[PDB]
Design a protein around this ligand. Structure first.
Ligand SMILES: [Cl-]
Ligand SMILES: [Cl-]
Ligand SMILES: [Cl-]
Ligand SMILES: [K+]
Ligand SMILES: [Mg+2]
Ligand SMILES: [Mg+2]
Ligand SMILES: [Mg+2]
Ligand SMILES: [Mg+2]
Ligand SMILES: [Mg+2]
Ligand SMILES: [Mg+2]
Ligand SMILES: [Mg+2]
Ligand SMILES: [Mg+2]
Ligand SMILES: [Mg+2]
Ligand SMILES: [Mg+2]
Ligand SMILES: [Mg+2]
Ligand SMILES: [Mg+2]
Ligand SMILES: [Mg+2]
Ligand SMILES: [Mg+2]
Ligand SMILES: [Mg+2]
Ligand SMILES: [Mg+2]
Ligand SMILES: [Mg+2]
Ligand SMILES: [Mg+2]
Ligand SMILES: [Mg+2]
Ligand SMILES: [Mg+2]
Ligand SMILES: [Mg+2]
Ligand SMILES: [Mg+2]
Ligand SMILES: [Mg+2]
Ligand SMILES: [Mg+2]
Ligand SMILES: [Mg+2]
Ligand SMILES: [Mg+2]
Ligand SMILES: [Mg+2]
Ligand SMILES: [Mg+2]
Ligand SMILES: [Mg+2]
Ligand SMILES: [Mg+2]
Ligand SMILES: [Mg+2]
Ligand SMILES: [Mg+2]
Ligand SMILES: [Mg+2]
Ligand SMILES: [Mg+2]
Ligand SMILES: [Mg+2]
Ligand SMILES: [Mg+2]
Ligand SMILES: [Mg+2]
Ligand SMILES: [Mg+2]
Ligand SMILES: [Mg+2]
Ligand SMILES: [Mg+2]
Ligand SMILES: [Mg+2]
Ligand SMILES: [Mg+2]
Ligand SMILES: [Mg+2]
Ligand SMILES: [Mg+2]
Ligand SMILES: [Mg+2]
Ligand SMILES: [Mg+2]
Ligand code: NA
Ligand code: NA
Ligand code: NA
Ligand code: NA
Ligand code: NA
Ligand code: NA
Ligand code: NA
Ligand code: NA
Ligand code: NA
Ligand code: NA
Ligand code: NA
Ligand code: NA
Ligand code: NA
Ligand code: NA
Ligand code: NA
Ligand code: NA
Ligand code: NA
Ligand code: NA
Ligand code: NA
Ligand code: NA
Lengths: 56, 73, 237
RNA sequence: ACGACCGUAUAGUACGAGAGGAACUACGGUUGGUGGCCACUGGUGUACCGGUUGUUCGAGAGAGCACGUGCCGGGUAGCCA
RNA sequence: CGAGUGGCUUGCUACCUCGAUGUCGGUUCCCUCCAUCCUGCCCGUGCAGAAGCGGGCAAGGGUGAGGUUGUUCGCCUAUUA
RNA sequence: GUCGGGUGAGAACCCCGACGGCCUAAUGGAUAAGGGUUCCUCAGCACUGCUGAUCAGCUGAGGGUUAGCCGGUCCUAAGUCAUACCGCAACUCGACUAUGACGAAAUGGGAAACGGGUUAAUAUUCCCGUGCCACUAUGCAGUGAAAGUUGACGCCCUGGGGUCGAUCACGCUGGGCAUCGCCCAGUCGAACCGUCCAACUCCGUGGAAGCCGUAAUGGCAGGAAGCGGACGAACGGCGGCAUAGGGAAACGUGAUUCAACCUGGGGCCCAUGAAAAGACGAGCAUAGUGUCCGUACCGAGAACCGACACAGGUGUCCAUGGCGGCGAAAGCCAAGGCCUGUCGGGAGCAACCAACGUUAGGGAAUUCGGCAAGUUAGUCCCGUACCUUCGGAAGAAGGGAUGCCUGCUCCGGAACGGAGCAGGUCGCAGUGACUCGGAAGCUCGGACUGUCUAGUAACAACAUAGGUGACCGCAAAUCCGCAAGGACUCGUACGGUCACUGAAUCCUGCCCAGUGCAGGUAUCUGAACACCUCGUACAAGAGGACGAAGGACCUGUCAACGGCGGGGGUCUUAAGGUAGCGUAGUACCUUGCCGCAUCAGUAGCGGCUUGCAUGAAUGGAUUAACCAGAGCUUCACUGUCCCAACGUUGGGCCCGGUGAACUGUACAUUCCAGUGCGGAGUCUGGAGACACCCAGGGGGAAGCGAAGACCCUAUGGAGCUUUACUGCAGGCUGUCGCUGAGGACUCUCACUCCGGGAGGAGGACACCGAUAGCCGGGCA
RNA sequence: GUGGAAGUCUGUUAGAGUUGGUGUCCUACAAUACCCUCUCGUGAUCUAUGUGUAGGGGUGAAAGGCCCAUCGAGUCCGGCA
């Protein structure tokens, strides 16, 4: 079976959804963890220095 | 017996399956009463259709050479 | 290279775990305050999914209902006893001290009260040879002479289901069904049939181990494969 | 846009001890190539006509579908070898 | 032993292309060369004849079918001018 | 699709009718996920729609989803999270152990709903009628009340009960047809309340010594049949519900086969087939309460995923519509749906191309190869070789039969079930279409079913049962983690880990020198601490004594890595190739030699065989069965070929509409030669050449497409290997700390493990922290 | 005779798979498609949903296969000009 188009047909599973805490469609309803803000994993807000250039 | 295996598996394998199952399917003398009505119910489990006595034995024989020794000593 | 299969095992992932939730009971000798008065009646005989051997359901006097490691020759209706003064008949459990030398025994404790550790598989048995006030010498199924505290409890008789190993599996499918009830990854791909990256015996233009198969005791995991600290190999001599 | 071969008469002759065995010329045919043609033979011919299976239109009659004819038998013109 | 011609083989060289000139063999379809295998016209013969052998002119036409092998090549079979 | 017609400024494709078609596990009906308003109405055509559009899933505006009894909700599953505890430098990190919570919308468990009616759009939700469940309150009954039952369960075979459907018979109602007398539709009516009860189990009677019974197994003096009785089923029968409802009308009765549903019997397991909430147990009247969330629509060749109105992908139920037949098969046809797998008009419609039909005579000559195509075919009877693991081979092969019509026989309770007989009779052909094997032999490989390179490899590769070796007594072996801890393990040697070989059958020789592993070890070597000597008012430092693991040394071991020659009638380096097999899928010479077979056979098979460079679990030989595996032979077959022809359908060609891309330094009508960085449309010399346009097959533009995969170069990269260099985990071992009392020893008090506790085992060891030596491609 | 076993046979039942055609397509209907052919189809079977394992790590009947068109070490951003 082709890994491309033919394998795209079984994709009717809901995972990432609108997050209660940040509003982004990143709350993974299976993991109950937001990949954008960290809700469900961290009380503190998800954030990293690599999200911007080193000297900025 | 091993006739269900057709021309598959070779001699030894089906010769022993037939031999083992042959003895397994023989009439067995119930330990409780003395009637020849003991049948295998599963792995190591034996039961008398006559009086219902359900007991432990070998996997394919109701009695094993080791179990017989116990009685003695 | 990559971690070898033996290393994937230790992580305890689903593929390597035993289907514990599907198991029936953790066979262990009952605890008795003392006196031995404890007796019960066999209510049924069941199949043990973790041992491919029968096991017995027992209702004890004080209301307790527990499955028991069943020796051969135990049936519904039988009365089993557990204690120092237990009669000396198959199916009963008592300390090696109260047991007459020369009698076959199973489910032997390693340390008094641990509930039983030795001789528990199909049709096997230990052999109580010597007694003493200090040591009870038992011969385990492997043939080893084991010195045990005479206070170690044991069950009279040989384990039920003897002879299971006498029948060949004949087909892959039968192994399959058994393996599904154990904590094991099956089937088994030979190391020499793998790539170098996956196993120390992997690689090559044809199949053969790269070095000799006997590996040192000190070899690290990932390398300890083949014949581990073999004192010898082959059949000759 | 014609190439080449076989056969007959020449002749059982010339030549030759014999065995064997030509030619010029005149004929008939074959093969390969070439161009055209369909009276003849052959192919096709889901034009056409008949037989017949299953099913549907109640039967009969007469029909549809079965891959672009259901299958089978015959086959005009034309096109062809 | 000596002097050459060809550019089909092999070797040599490293000029051309590494921001790619698609491989071998086969096939199909077209043109050509002559160092001519057959055919035409000839010369010599250890040319009686018949069948040959060798040579000259000559490239109009022909040079086919098969068995093994991917084979080119080559071996083999029956036809063939 | 076509002919008429409707609307409209405008109609091939928007709507009506007729005629003609397409879809039958779907192109129909109901839905899960997912989409998210796509649903309905009105108004529109700038956008989207493969052409057009008055149409629309498009644009704009409004409207639309109603629940005690359908789902959610509640329960618990694999498993997940939170808190506590502990770890970690630390945490948003981490395993265990507690507690708590989460975790199933078709498709797990589960209190309770049916029928009719209604809207443009909802509907077990609204309306009408009827029924039912739970909780609470009141009243009567009741003292019972928690034991038990249920929820609640695998795979295979099978009996009985039985509804719908389908079919048959006959009657009634309506319709169709018009030579007969046939053909079609209907003939209805729920939940619920009540009642009936087969099977299983049991009781009494009875008293079988051979009877009883089954599809089959089976049953019995431990009490068979018969007889009587207890318990006891359907989504089933029956009565009510119902001068409810529905129907234009009639508003049936019997039967067979019987999905659903109910209830039994048998067989299998080195496999044992959830749990919890809840229900029952545990009566009745009346009344009150029953909130919250979901509900439109699509569910796909246009509403989902695939950038698209994408020929792909995507779960469940309807598996009982008719004929057909073994059939959920084909073909044909209902119900229901559709003409939207959405551009049309024209030319006998040429060449050429895609699918395909038929081709005389020959019959594999084609070709790497029978690739492609063809042949055969269903069912019954007869008959069936080598070989074989006795199963098989086998549908071997081969031979015969096959329709219709008339009258019958047999099996069975019967079928609208099956098996036969006699007679008549038509065709070229009776499995008449459809459905539907070509067959046989030799050799190689792997035993077999199975697995695999999603996207050029399905194989001989992997797996497998079987054979074998290794480690380990469980405070284990093996493995994961930095740690806290963890998998194996609800396990315990008939175990489970680590490897090799790869069914069966006959077998599996010789070698321990090297390497590996393991055991032993007088002596030799072997680190650090402590100790002794020298040195230093101390220290650095030098040396000694002691000596662990390890090494030297010795031994064991090849189903451990591997080896099995040259020379002579021993030498390297341990042995010197045994049974077998052999020009091999291993043989350079090589198309080896002989034979078979063919006109001819580098092929194939057999024999020989000095084997460039066969050989025994790096398994050897051999082998029935199996195989989309490799090679070869025969019969049959045939357009593969001789050698091509004609035809069919869709294109191609012309016309309306829609409308890209690739590619482009410039110039460019070229051809023959030459030259040039040696492969020129453009330079040089000649030749030819009036321009534009249509169709064609692709000779050239070293045509387009891709900064060559080959090769080399770079003090480039990466994956992999090892007795490369250097290090790092990990294992072993000495030492110090924890650590205590009296080169060998006892004890108990730390510490560790077993025990519910009492206590037991072990014990200054082990664990842990630190350090030293050895091993150490496991890793960088 | 009964019985009805089997990693058993035939089989486009459903469903799974993917051998040949080196066909059609190859600016595709499609960044793995279409048709015919072909294999399996009671079991080591196929499948929905839920759920676990994560990057030198998983998973792997082992092909360096697979881990969202990405694999001899995923993807994203950062180190980084
Ligand atoms: Cl096992
Ligand atoms: Cl719902
Ligand atoms: Cl029955
Ligand atoms: K090049
Ligand atoms: Mg991928
Ligand atoms: Mg346990
Ligand atoms: Mg498992
Ligand atoms: Mg294996
Ligand atoms: Mg490999
Ligand atoms: Mg390695
Ligand atoms: Mg091998
Ligand atoms: Mg090997
Ligand atoms: Mg037709
Ligand atoms: Mg080119
Ligand atoms: Mg000349
Ligand atoms: Mg010429
Ligand atoms: Mg609409
Ligand atoms: Mg409108
Ligand atoms: Mg919940
Ligand atoms: Mg449910
Ligand atoms: Mg609706
Ligand atoms: Mg709806
Ligand atoms: Mg469409
Ligand atoms: Mg012909
Ligand atoms: Mg040939
Ligand atoms: Mg040829
Ligand atoms: Mg073929
Ligand atoms: Mg009868
Ligand atoms: Mg036919
Ligand atoms: Mg060969
Ligand atoms: Mg195989
Ligand atoms: Mg592939
Ligand atoms: Mg295959
Ligand atoms: Mg393939
Ligand atoms: Mg193999
Ligand atoms: Mg094995
Ligand atoms: Mg074994
Ligand atoms: Mg084994
Ligand atoms: Mg030979
Ligand atoms: Mg050997
Ligand atoms: Mg010029
Ligand atoms: Mg380059
Ligand atoms: Mg290279
Ligand atoms: Mg490198
Ligand atoms: Mg403990
Ligand atoms: Mg390295
Ligand atoms: Mg099968
Ligand atoms: Mg099949
Ligand atoms: Mg899943
Ligand atoms: Mg490889
Ligand atoms: Na290897
Ligand atoms: Na170039
Ligand atoms: Na060529
Ligand atoms: Na010539
Ligand atoms: Na040849
Ligand atoms: Na249209
Ligand atoms: Na009833
Ligand atoms: Na039918
Ligand atoms: Na199979
Ligand atoms: Na050795
Ligand atoms: Na050795
Ligand atoms: Na060898
Ligand atoms: Na197969
Ligand atoms: Na043809
Ligand atoms: Na061209
Ligand atoms: Na690499
Ligand atoms: Na029989
Ligand atoms: Na295919
Ligand atoms: Na990585
Ligand atoms: Na960067």
């Amino acid at each position: 079976t082709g890994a491309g188009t033919p394998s795209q047909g079984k994709k009717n599973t809901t995972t990432h959804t609108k997050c209660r805490r940040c509003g982004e469609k990143s709350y993974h309803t299976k993991k109950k963890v937001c990949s954008s803000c960290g809700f469900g994993k961290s009380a503190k807000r998800r954030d990293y220095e690599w999200q911007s250039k080193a000297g900025e | 017996r091993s006739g269900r295996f057709g021309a598959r598996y070779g001699r030894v394998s089906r010769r022993r399956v037939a031999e083992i199952e042959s003895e397994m399917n023989e009439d067995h003398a119930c330990p409780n009463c003395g009637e020849d009505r003991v049948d295998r119910q599963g792995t190591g489990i034996w039961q008398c259709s006559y009086c219902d006595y359900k007991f432990t034995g070998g996997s394919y024989k109701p009695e094993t050479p080791g179990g017989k020794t116990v009685r003695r000593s | 290279g990559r971690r070898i299969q033996g290393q994937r095992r230790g992580r305890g992932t689903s593929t390597f775990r035993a289907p514990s939730h599907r198991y029936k009971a953790d066979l262990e000798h009952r605890k008795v305050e003392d006196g031995d008065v404890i007796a019960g009646t066999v209510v049924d005989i069941e199949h043990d999914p973790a041992r491919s051997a029968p096991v017995a359901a027992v209702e004890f006097e004080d209301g307790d209902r527990r499955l028991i490691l069943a020796p051969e020759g135990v049936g519904v209706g039988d009365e089993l006893q557990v204690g120092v003064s237990a009669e000396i008949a198959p199916g009963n459990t008592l300390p090696l001290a109260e047991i007459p030398e020369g009698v076959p025994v199973c489910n032997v404790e390693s340390s008094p009260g641990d509930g039983g550790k030795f001789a528990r598989a199909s049709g096997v048995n230990a052999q109580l040879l010597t007694h003493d006030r200090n040591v009870a010498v038992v011969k385990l199924p492997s043939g080893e002479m084991k010195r045990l505290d005479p206070q170690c409890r044991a069950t009279i008789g040989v384990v039920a289901g003897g002879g299971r190993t006498d029948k060949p599996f004949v087909k892959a499918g039968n192994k399959h069904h058994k393996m599904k009830a154990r904590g094991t990854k099956w089937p088994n791909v030979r190391g020499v049939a793998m790539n170098a990256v996956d196993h120390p015996f992997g690689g090559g233009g044809r199949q053969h181990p790269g070095k000799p198969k006997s590996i040192s005791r000190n070899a690290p995991p990932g390398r300890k494969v083949g014949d581990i600290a073999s004192k010898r190999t082959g059949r000759g001599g």
